[PDB]
Amino acid sequence: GTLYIEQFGSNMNEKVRNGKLQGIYGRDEEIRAIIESLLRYNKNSPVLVGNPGTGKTTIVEGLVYRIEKGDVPKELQGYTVISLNFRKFTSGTSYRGEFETRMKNIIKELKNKKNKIILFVDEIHLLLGAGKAEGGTDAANLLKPVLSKGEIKLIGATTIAEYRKFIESCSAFERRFEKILVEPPSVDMTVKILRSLKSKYENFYGINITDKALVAAAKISDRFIKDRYLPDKAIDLLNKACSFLQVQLSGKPRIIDVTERDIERLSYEISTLEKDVDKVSKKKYNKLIKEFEEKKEQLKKYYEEYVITGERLKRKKEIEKKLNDLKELTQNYVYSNKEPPIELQNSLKEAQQKYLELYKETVAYVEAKTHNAMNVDAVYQEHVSYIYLRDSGMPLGSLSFESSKGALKLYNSLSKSIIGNEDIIKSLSDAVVKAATGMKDPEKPIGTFLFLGPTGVGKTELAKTLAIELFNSKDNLIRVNMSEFTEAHSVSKITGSPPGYVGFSDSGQLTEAVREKPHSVVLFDELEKAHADVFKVLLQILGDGYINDNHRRNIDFSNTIIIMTSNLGAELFKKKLFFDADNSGTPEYKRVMEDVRLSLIKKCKKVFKPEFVNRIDKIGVFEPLNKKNLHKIVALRFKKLEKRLEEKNIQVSVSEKAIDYIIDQSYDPELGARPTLIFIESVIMTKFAIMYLKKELVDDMDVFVDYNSKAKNLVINLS
């Protein structure tokens, strides 16, 4: 067959006869349209115009598969299909005959009936650059008069943008090529492709793929990605699964490599005999000894559980001979029974009492480990998301991986750092609970909130804690300084400048930054100070993820928690100072608060244009702090001084008098206990941070704070 190729390019049909091209899944309407456009009275050149993820190139291999197998009309039987550019982009670099040997040996080969070659081009827009030289015109312009003949046949495929920029610019080279649009396949069709490739991956890779992984491989990638079109994403995620399981399950798992290093390299070298004196910094070296003891729990526990999951594997040796073989040996066409009460209904109970007990425990190990599941050959749905979460802006673990234990303790962990208004937290934490499960809204962004409240309470602090907990980083916190966006002209800074104006290279300040981190909270600082035109864009933001850039690409605001604090604290309701600073009088506080909250909602109609209120999932009024609440906050702020300022050895303690001294002095109703964050930095931190002798510098800080209540600073040096 090399006589017709002229040994550049390749015949497709010989590769079909080799074991290299199996049967392509049905794109039955798309292929038969090309067969009609190939047999024609003139111009004989279908082009697969379509998206980059269409798989149009593969389709042609499905057509060649129909050529060799004979599912084609009689006029098209026996043709050889040849791709043109495999040696180089110029199909042969000549250097002896610079125009004779290549262009004339192809067009001459289109001759009489026994020459049944069919040309094929991978990208037809590179032909506009082919033959480009100072002394010679493009090879595509030479093929333009050739296409008015019945002997030439061409099939090509480009992206839509390269079809616009290159093919349509010539407008006569555009004309003799027939459009056949390759529509991207629907969501259900991408599932039907992956069911064809189970026999590929379970034979050529050997790993098993559950059907729960197949449905998740399409549907997770579709709603969460708005480029690199559909059928590649359903296939490339499972192609990442073929390399993910192969490196690890055949060899040692990754978790053994991580717990091994920590105990010996840093916690063992510092614990040695080098400093037994304990005179310089006597508090610190007591803690360095304790660090070695807990790290013994790392090595021993996972090793035995690896045997326990390894115990499941030799139960998998047993099911091969009983559940797999006994169905495949006795059950045949000869009378189809072979005494079904013996050995055959017993095997049905073996499917229930051996396999399903193995099956449930392997399923139960999926919620246990949630990624890098040891001794587990089947692909699972949570491992499919783990491959996606590698690609998205996620750490290796922050509370989305830790399903069904971390999501419920997320309500407990937010109650640690933030104290009041747990009913808002119940609405806040359950939105994460809906996101962690299949209770997901594909249009609406998950967790939109409107944080009205008095000035001074920790409203914006929740967005800091969710970035530290749900996303393990302050990078996923995205502040929006609405004080920059007060003007009516400032609204273009959100979505970027429109085309033809100053800028336009960036898609904007906020809208660009969400594109690389779709899993991130979106903080809006203070919605009380903005022009209402800025609110007009926000109607789409809370409404859908259909936010377009200047280049009009969608931005994925799914999995974005849109926190929108705004004060209005000064204006009225919570502005009225809680008359009774009681913790919560149930017959009083509960009744009056809702009456002000209704008013707060009523006020919104006054200003936030009540269309915007319908987009809110939960308006939450924060309760203003006083002596009962403020007494409980401040000790956790000293615990924030415990975690940050130790290692350099600071471990504070508080008393009955140590909190009472702060509350009667630093509480201001007009500022709403804001200077309680200043009274810490302004007077006791002056007793800290000194050069020498007013603070123990490196040695120890085990101080127990007390005063004689004399309205003067007396730091009793008990440290």
Ligand X SMILES: Nc1ncnc2c1ncn2[C@@H]1O[C@H](COP(=O)(O)OP(=O)(O)OP(O)(O)=S)[C@@H](O)[C@H]1O
Contact residues toward a second copy (CB under 8 A) are: 2, 5, 7-8, 10, 86-87, 92-93, 165, 169-172
The entry of a second copy, ligand X, none near residue 170 (CB within 5 to 8 angstroms by kind) is: a second copy
Reported as type and span, the H/E element at residue 714 is: none
Exposure string for 551-582, b = 16+ CB within 10 A, e = fewer: eeeebbbbbbbbbbbbbbbeeebbeeebeeee
Q: Are 440 and 446 in contact (CB under 8 A)?
A: yes
- Residue 397 has which token pair? 């673990």
The entry of ligand X, a second copy, none near residue 55 (CB within 5 to 8 angstroms by kind) is: ligand X
Q: How far is the CB of 12 from a second copy (least distance, A)?
A: 14
Taking CA atoms, 561 is separated from 204, 242, 445, 557, 664, in Å, by 42, 33, 7, 8, 37
Query: Within 10 Å of residue 5's Cβ, how many Cβ atoms?
Result: 17
Q: Give the Cα separation of 205 and 214 in Å (integer).
A: 16
Phi-psi region of 552 (alpha: psi -120 to 50; beta: other; left: phi over 0): left
Reported as type and span, the H/E element at residue 669 is: none
Q: Are 30 and 59 in contact (CB under 8 A)?
A: yes
Binding mask 568-597 for ligand X (x = CB under 6 A): -x----------------------------
By beta-carbon proximity to a second copy, the closer residue of 171 and 412 is: 171
By beta-carbon proximity to a second copy, the closer residue of 82 and 387 is: 82
Taking CB under 6 A as the criterion, which residues in 336-395 touch ligand X? none
Task: Determine the longest span between alpha carbons in the chain, in angstroms.
Answer: 113
Q: How far is the CB of 108 from a second copy (least distance, A)?
A: 20
- Residue 101 has which token pair? 């040997």
Q: Which of 12, 16, 49, 55 binds ligand X (CB under 6 A)?
A: 55
The entry of ligand X, a second copy, none near residue 27 (CB within 5 to 8 angstroms by kind) is: ligand X
By beta-carbon proximity to a second copy, the closer residue of 177 and 451 is: 177
The entry of ligand X, a second copy, none near residue 36 (CB within 5 to 8 angstroms by kind) is: none
Binding mask 623-642 for ligand X (x = CB under 6 A): ----------x---------
The entry of a second copy, ligand X, none near residue 617 (CB within 5 to 8 angstroms by kind) is: none
Q: How far is the CB of 619 from ligand X (least distance, A)?
A: 16
Stretch that binds ligand X, among 47-55, 92-100, 400-408, 440-448 (CB under 6 A): 47-55
The entry of ligand X, a second copy, none near residue 567 (CB within 5 to 8 angstroms by kind) is: ligand X
Residues 6+ apart with CB under 8 A from 144: 172, 173, 176
> How would you classify the pairing of strands 117-120 and 80-83?
parallel
By beta-carbon proximity to a second copy, the closer residue of 87 and 648 is: 87
The entry of ligand X, a second copy, none near residue 456 (CB within 5 to 8 angstroms by kind) is: ligand X
Q: How far is the CB of 530 from a second copy (least distance, A)?
A: 55
The entry of a second copy, ligand X, none near residue 235 (CB within 5 to 8 angstroms by kind) is: ligand X
By beta-carbon proximity to a second copy, the closer residue of 14 and 377 is: 14
Determine if 235 is a binding residue for ligand X (CB under 6 A).
yes
Q: How far is the CB of 683 from ligand X (least distance, A)?
A: 16
**Eight-state DSSP code of residue 548:** E
Q: How far is the CB of 125 from a second copy (least distance, A)?
A: 24
Query: Within 10 Å of residue 56's Cβ, how many Cβ atoms?
Result: 24
Q: How far is the CB of 418 from ligand X (least distance, A)?
A: 4
Around 330, how many Cα atoms within 13 Å sit in the side-chain half-sphere?
16
By beta-carbon proximity to a second copy, the closer residue of 13 and 626 is: 13
The entry of ligand X, a second copy, none near residue 615 (CB within 5 to 8 angstroms by kind) is: none
The residue with tokens 């009205």 is 452
Angle formed by the axes of helices 381-391 and 211-224, nearest 10°: 30
State the amino acid at position 657 in one-letter form.
K
Binding mask 676-695 for ligand X (x = CB under 6 A): -x------------------
Determine if 156 is a binding residue for ligand X (CB under 6 A).
no
Determine if 167 is a binding residue for ligand X (CB under 6 A).
no
Residues 6+ apart with CB under 8 A from 106: 6, 91, 119
By beta-carbon proximity to a second copy, the closer residue of 2 and 324 is: 2
The entry of ligand X, a second copy, none near residue 455 (CB within 5 to 8 angstroms by kind) is: ligand X
By beta-carbon proximity to ligand X, the closer residue of 668 and 706 is: 668
By beta-carbon proximity to a second copy, the closer residue of 13 and 495 is: 13
Determine if 125 is a binding residue for ligand X (CB under 6 A).
no
The entry of ligand X, a second copy, none near residue 5 (CB within 5 to 8 angstroms by kind) is: a second copy
Q: Are 618 and 449 in contact (CB under 8 A)?
A: yes
Q: Strands, E, within 468-600: which ranges? A: 477-478, 521-524, 547-548, 554-555, 562-565
By beta-carbon proximity to a second copy, the closer residue of 16 and 197 is: 16
- Residue 248 has which token pair? 């690890």
Residues followed by a break in the chain (C to N exceeding 2.5 Å) are: none
Determine if 662 is a binding residue for ligand X (CB under 6 A).
no
Interior angle at CA 297, CA 292 and CA 298, nearest 5: 90
By beta-carbon proximity to ligand X, the closer residue of 156 and 569 is: 569
Four-residue CA torsion sign, 46, 49, 52, 55: negative
Q: Which of 9, 13, 16, 27 binds ligand X (CB under 6 A)?
A: 27
The entry of a second copy, ligand X, none near residue 412 (CB within 5 to 8 angstroms by kind) is: none
Partner residues linked to 133 by β-bridges: 136
Stretch that binds ligand X, among 263-271, 284-292, 414-422, 511-519 (CB under 6 A): 414-422
Q: How far is the CB of 171 from a second copy (least distance, A)?
A: 5
Taking CB under 6 A as the criterion, which residues in 436-475 touch ligand X? 455-461
Long-range contacts of the stretch 386-393 (C-beta < 8 A, 24+):
387/237, 387/240, 387/241, 387/244, 388/220, 388/221, 388/224, 388/237, 389/519, 392/224, 392/517, 392/518, 392/519, 393/476, 393/516, 393/517, 393/518, 393/519, 393/520
DSSP symbols for 128-184:
GTTT-BTTB--HHHHHTTGGGSSS----EEE-HHHIIIIIHHHSSTTTTSEEEEEPP
Stretch that binds ligand X, among 34-42, 46-54, 344-352, 549-557 (CB under 6 A): 46-54
The entry of a second copy, ligand X, none near residue 633 (CB within 5 to 8 angstroms by kind) is: ligand X
Total residues at interface with ligand X (CB under 6 A): 29
Q: How far is the CB of 101 from a second copy (least distance, A)?
A: 12
State the first-to-last Cα distance of the chain, in angstroms, to the nearest integer: 91
Residue nearest to ligand X (CB): 458
Q: How far is the CB of 593 from ligand X (least distance, A)?
A: 16
**Eight-state DSSP code of residue 119:** E
* Interface with ligand X (CB under 6 A): 24-25, 27, 52-58, 193, 231-232, 235, 418-420, 455-461, 565, 567, 569, 633, 677
